[PDB]
Amino acid sequence: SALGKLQDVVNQNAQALNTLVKQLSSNFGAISSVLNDILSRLDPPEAEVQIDRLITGRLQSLQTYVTQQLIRAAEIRASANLAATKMSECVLGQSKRVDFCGKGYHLMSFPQSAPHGVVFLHVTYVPAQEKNFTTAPAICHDGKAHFPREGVFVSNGTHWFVTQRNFYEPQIITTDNTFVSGNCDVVIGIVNNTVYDP
Amino acid sequence: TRAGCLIGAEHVNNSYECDIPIGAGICASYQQSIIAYTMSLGAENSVAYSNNSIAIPTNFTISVTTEILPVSMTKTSVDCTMYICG
Amino acid sequence: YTMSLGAENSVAYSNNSIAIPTNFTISVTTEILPVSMTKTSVDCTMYICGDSTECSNLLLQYGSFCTQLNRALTGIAVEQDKNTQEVFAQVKQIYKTPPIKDFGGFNFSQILPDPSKPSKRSPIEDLLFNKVICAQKFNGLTVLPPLLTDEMIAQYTSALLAGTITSGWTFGAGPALQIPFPMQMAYRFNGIGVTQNVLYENQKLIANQFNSAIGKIQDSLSSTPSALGKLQDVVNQNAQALNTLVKQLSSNFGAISSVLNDILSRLDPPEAEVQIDRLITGRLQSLQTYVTQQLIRAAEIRASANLAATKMSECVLGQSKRVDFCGKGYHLMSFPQSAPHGVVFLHVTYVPAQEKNFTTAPAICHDGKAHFPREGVFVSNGTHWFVTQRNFYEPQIITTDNTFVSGNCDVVIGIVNNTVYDP
Amino acid sequence: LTGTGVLTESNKKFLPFQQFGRDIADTTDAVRDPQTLEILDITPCSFGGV
Numbered sequence: 001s002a003l004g005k006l007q008d009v010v011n012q013n014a015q016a017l018n019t020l021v022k023q024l025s026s027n028f029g030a031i032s033s034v035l036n037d038i039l040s041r042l043d044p045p046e047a048e049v050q051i052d053r054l055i056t057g058r059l060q061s062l063q064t065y066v067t068q069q070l071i072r073a074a075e076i077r078a079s080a081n082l083a084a085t086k087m088s089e090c091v092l093g094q095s096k097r098v099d100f101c102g103k104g105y106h107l108m109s110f111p112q113s114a115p116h117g118v119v120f121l122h123v124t125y126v127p128a129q130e131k132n133f134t135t136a137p138a139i140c141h142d143g144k145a146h147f148p149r150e151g152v153f154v155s156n157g158t159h160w161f162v163t164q165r166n167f168y169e170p171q172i173i174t175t176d177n178t179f180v181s182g183n184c185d186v187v188i189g190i191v192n193n194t195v196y197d198p
Numbered sequence: 199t200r201a202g203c204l205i206g207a208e209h210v211n212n213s214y215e216c217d218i219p220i221g222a223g224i225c226a227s228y229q230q231s232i233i234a235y236t237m238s239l240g241a242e243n244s245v246a247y248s249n250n251s252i253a254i255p256t257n258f259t260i261s262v263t264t265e266i267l268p269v270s271m272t273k274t275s276v277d278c279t280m281y282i283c284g
Numbered sequence: 285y286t287m288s289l290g291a292e293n294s295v296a297y298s299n300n301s302i303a304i305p306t307n308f309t310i311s312v313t314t315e316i317l318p319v320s321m322t323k324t325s326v327d328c329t330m331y332i333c334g335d336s337t338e339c340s341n342l343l344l345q346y347g348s349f350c351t352q353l354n355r356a357l358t359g360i361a362v363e364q365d366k367n368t369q370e371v372f373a374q375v376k377q378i379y380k381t382p383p384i385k386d387f388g389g390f391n392f393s394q395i396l397p398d399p400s401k402p403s404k405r406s407p408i409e410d411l412l413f414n415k416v417i418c419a420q421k422f423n424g425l426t427v428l429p430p431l432l433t434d435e436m437i438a439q440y441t442s443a444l445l446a447g448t449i450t451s452g453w454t455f456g457a458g459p460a461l462q463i464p465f466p467m468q469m470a471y472r473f474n475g476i477g478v479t480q481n482v483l484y485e486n487q488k489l490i491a492n493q494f495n496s497a498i499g500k501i502q503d504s505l506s507s508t509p510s511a512l513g514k515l516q517d518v519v520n521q522n523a524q525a526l527n528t529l530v531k532q533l534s535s536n537f538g539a540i541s542s543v544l545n546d547i548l549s550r551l552d553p554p555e556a557e558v559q560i561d562r563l564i565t566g567r568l569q570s571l572q573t574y575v576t577q578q579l580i581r582a583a584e585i586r587a588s589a590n591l592a593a594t595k596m597s598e599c600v601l602g603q604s605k606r607v608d609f610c611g612k613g614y615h616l617m618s619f620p621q622s623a624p625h626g627v628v629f630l631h632v633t634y635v636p637a638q639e640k641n642f643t644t645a646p647a648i649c650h651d652g653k654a655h656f657p658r659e660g661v662f663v664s665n666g667t668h669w670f671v672t673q674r675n676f677y678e679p680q681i682i683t684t685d686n687t688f689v690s691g692n693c694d695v696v697i698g699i700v701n702n703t704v705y706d707p
Numbered sequence: 708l709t710g711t712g713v714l715t716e717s718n719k720k721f722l723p724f725q726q727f728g729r730d731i732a733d734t735t736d737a738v739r740d741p742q743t744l745e746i747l748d749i750t751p752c753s754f755g756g757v
């Protein structure tokens with residue numbers, strides 16, 4: 001069922017054609033669904049009446065088919081447009097768009113050809129094995145409020161570190177990985193620690 | 199049910215992922231006999247939120263998922279005159 | 285009158301003048317999208333022939349038209365559940381908020397479920413649902429219930445809200461990683477090129493602007509009946525289509541009567557079939573018109589649902605860089621709210637305010653070297669040069685720690701002389 | 708006036724001259740009994756998809 005999306009397209013169109021063909025067996029009120037039987041039995045003055053009924057029915061059947069193909073084609077076009085967009089943004093680049101190139105943080109994608117379609121293999125980064133830390137919005141040192149330049153301030157229960165947000169990597173809090181803005185009397189939840197100066 | 203009268207399925211209180219949709223929150227599945235149930239929307243997950251607690255990944259996995267999209271459709275051509283009149 | 289295109293605004297452009305916001309506001313806007321359409325089902329045979337065997341037998345002469353029509357409407361009905369699922373069922377787990385709503389002053393009571401009501405809707409969702417058959421059924425026109433009930437959709441929405449509030453965007457990528465709300469907002473400030481200290485040093489202001497904006501949403505919707513016109517339009521179009529379809533059963537289409545039973549009670553088969561043929565043709569044509577318009581309309585709804593699903597992913601489960609995709613302003617976050625056959629997004633954006641004029645320069649010349657700002661822009665208050673973050677006036681002393689050197693002073697056009705402080 | 712359905716006592720305020728009623732679909736949904744002058748509501752016999 002993995003390729004159901006492509007099989008569904010095949011099935012819908014095959015069904016539409018089969019229906020269209022089967023409509024040629026309908027009388028539509030005529031003495032026969034077979035045009036040759038009408039022509040071999042009746043003279044023109046009467047044959048035309050029977051044929052008119054078949055033409056009306058068969059033209060209506062064909063207009064139904066075409067209308068449904070136009071609507072279905074529009075759906076396929078939209079799908080193709082999406083596929084083209086993903087090719088550009090997932091394969092020819094790295095996308096920031098959430099859930100656009102698979103679940104997780106998109107790294108890259110690889111296209112694979114399929115029958116009347118495309119398959120994208122989305123390679124994503126998925127965070128794992130998280131653990132609890134105590135955190136603070138800022139560190140108070142020498143009366144100054146220090147904020148992390150890239151990461152977040154965390155405590156392992158005794159010591160404060162600064163770490164990149166998506167991967168635990170506890171560095172010593174220093175003036176090279178923080179910046180100062182204002183004093184310690186403004187930030188809510190600010191905690192006291194040392195900020196090391198190299 | 200709100201979808202109509204369902205006969206031949208055993209209704210149970212146990213909620214499962216939806217298998218065969220009935221309507222109005224009701225789904226049926228084969229478990230043997232056919233059963234009816236209110237579909238689950240997923241497992242409950244209470245996040246350990248606090249004003250000073252953060253969870254940080256110590257590891258990661260590389261996941262590969264497959265997305266399948268239709269691109270093209272069979273290029274049919276129907277001869278109107280022949281179809282109708284042969 | 286000739287319509288206005290808006291007020292004229294001449295921007296005070298010059299080759300050395302920049303405007304920088306000294307303040308900001310937190311704006312919340314509402315975006316309303318259709319997701320689903322009423323799942324109608326029309327019994328072709330009954331619509332055309334009722335319970336008449338004579339008509340039914342004549343109808344068979346037309347082949348499988350009724351099978352096609354029943355199939356087309358079935359396909360639409362199924363799509364409608366797919367549309368809803370794509371938009372709302374985006375979360376692996378049902379997340380719940382804490383018993384204690386402490387988010388650093390941020391108040392979500394109007395978007396979170398109200399436990400005092402049986403429906404478990406938020407105050408806003410309740411409002412949305414308040415804002416937005418037999419005669420049809422008796423002719424073979426039935427309505428099928430959505431696979432997901434309104435209570436299930438609300439549960440999906442509340443799960444998304446709980447995830448967003450307690451774990452930010454992490455739950456939309458992998459496991460839900462808890463984070464203090466103020467800290468989450470600080471991350472979202474960084475996401476729009478504003479430093480995190482701007483959040484923390486203005487936390488109460490921001491929480492207050494946010495809380496006020498949310499309150500305004502409820503009032504705006506309540507006092508504006510047309511607010512949900514997009515969803516009402518869908519309801520009206522489909523109701524109109526059904527009403528038209530039903531009324532077509534009163535048409536003679538050239539027959540002696542629009543009532544099939546009257547034809548059958550008056551005429552013998554040889555003549556009744558002629559009159560019935562006229563009704564079948566007219567009623568089949570009426571039904572094919574209905575179905576065709578439902579397929580076209582369904583396609584429009586599908587596109588809307590696809591957009592809604594995209595916004596759910598990119599506006600709610602993450603922070604979007606796409607301009608005007610998640611409201612007007614710099615997107616911070618969004619909160620979904622359930623609506624009748626649709627979804628309402630409350631987009632929270634950062635809007636720059638109270639800008640003021642500064643003199644600017646592309647570079648600072650010091651010791652023969654051209655210094656460029658590492659993150660911000662060089663500005664002068666008329667006497668002294670500072671470097672500031674671009675989206676919020678915060679004039680720092682120009683130092684070697686907030687600039688970088690590239691080449692000499694003889695290349696850059698508009699370079700100005702100043703001191704670059706070395707700590 | 709022929710048809711198939713379930714007949715019940717009507718609560719419709721028929722005027723003395725009105726012989727039958729119709730719904731928004733413009734189909735007979737009530738009749739006046741030609742002998743008793745009783746007003747009867749007409750609904751279709753229960754049906755639905757299977």
Ligand SMILES: *[C@@H]1O[C@H](CO)[C@@H](O[C@@H]2O[C@H](CO)[C@@H](O)[C@H](O)[C@H]2NC(C)=O)[C@H](O)[C@H]1NC(C)=O
Binds near residue numbers: 306307308309489492
């Ligand atoms: C930035 O704008 C906000 C309002 O959007 C200012 O806060 C208001 O200040 C006035 C006094 O001038 C108070 O009466 C209002 O109640 C405040 N509003 C809120 C929500 O607190 C804020 O002072 C401005 N900041 C700067 C630097 O101009």
Ligand SMILES: *[C@@H]1O[C@H](CO)[C@@H](O[C@@H]2O[C@H](CO)[C@@H](O)[C@H](O)[C@H]2NC(C)=O)[C@H](O)[C@H]1NC(C)=O
Binds near residue numbers: 385391392393394499
């Ligand atoms: C969050 O905001 C709501 C209002 O939107 C607050 O609820 C109001 O509380 C006051 C009492 O302080 C009542 O008089 C109002 O009638 C309440 N309004 C509604 C709609 O309930 C709620 O208290 C706020 N939460 C916090 C923690 O401040």
Ligand SMILES: *[C@@H]1O[C@H](CO)[C@@H](O)[C@H](O)[C@H]1NC(C)=O
Binds near residue numbers: 130131132246253
């Ligand atoms: C964090 O602490 C909570 C209890 O407050 C616990 O349920 C949760 O599992 C912990 N997180 C991790 C990764 O252990």
Ligand SMILES: *[C@@H]1O[C@H](CO)[C@@H](O)[C@H](O)[C@H]1NC(C)=O
Binds near residue numbers: 156157159
């Ligand atoms: C925190 O980290 C420091 C440095 O690695 C270590 O010495 C200390 O014991 C750790 N504390 C806890 C509770 O693990």
Ligand SMILES: *[C@@H]1O[C@H](CO)[C@@H](O)[C@H](O)[C@H]1NC(C)=O
Binds near residue numbers: 188189190249
């Ligand atoms: C968290 O809440 C507690 C009260 O439950 C309070 O004492 C503490 O200061 C708060 N911390 C922050 C960062 O808000």
Ligand SMILES: *[C@@H]1O[C@H](CO)[C@@H](O)[C@H](O)[C@H]1NC(C)=O
Binds near residue numbers: 140191
């Ligand atoms: C931090 O230390 C200072 C003294 O240097 C003290 O006055 C202040 O209250 C402390 N703040 C906290 C949160 O411990």
Ligand SMILES: *[C@@H]1O[C@H](CO)[C@@H](O)[C@H](O)[C@H]1NC(C)=O
Binds near residue numbers: 209210211
């Ligand atoms: C389901 O729970 C109800 C009580 O609400 C009980 O009466 C019923 O028998 C239960 N059905 C099954 C299969 O357990």
Ligand SMILES: *[C@@H]1O[C@H](CO)[C@@H](O)[C@H](O)[C@H]1NC(C)=O
Binds near residue numbers: 296639640641
């Ligand atoms: C900047 O100066 C122009 C005049 O050159 C003035 O029209 C404009 O309002 C000023 N900008 C601000 C924020 O005052």
Ligand SMILES: *[C@@H]1O[C@H](CO)[C@@H](O)[C@H](O)[C@H]1NC(C)=O
Binds near residue numbers: 665666667668
């Ligand atoms: C520019 O800022 C400096 C430092 O705050 C101040 O001393 C100076 O007076 C300001 N100049 C003007 C025109 O405001």
Ligand SMILES: *[C@@H]1O[C@H](CO)[C@@H](O)[C@H](O)[C@H]1NC(C)=O
Binds near residue numbers: 697698699
């Ligand atoms: C701006 O234009 C003036 C002439 O109007 C010129 O003297 C000045 O050098 C220009 N400054 C820059 C940065 O181009």
Ligand SMILES: *[C@@H]1O[C@H](CO)[C@@H](O)[C@H](O)[C@H]1NC(C)=O
Binds near residue numbers: 649699700701
């Ligand atoms: C900057 O100062 C140098 C002398 O150190 C001078 O030669 C140069 O012309 C000045 N440039 C400007 C724009 O004032």
Ligand SMILES: *[C@@H]1O[C@H](CO)[C@@H](O)[C@H](O)[C@H]1NC(C)=O
Binds near residue numbers: 741743
């Ligand atoms: C005959 O019909 C009239 C109404 O037209 C009614 O009043 C009368 O009672 C009926 N008589 C009998 C025997 O049914």
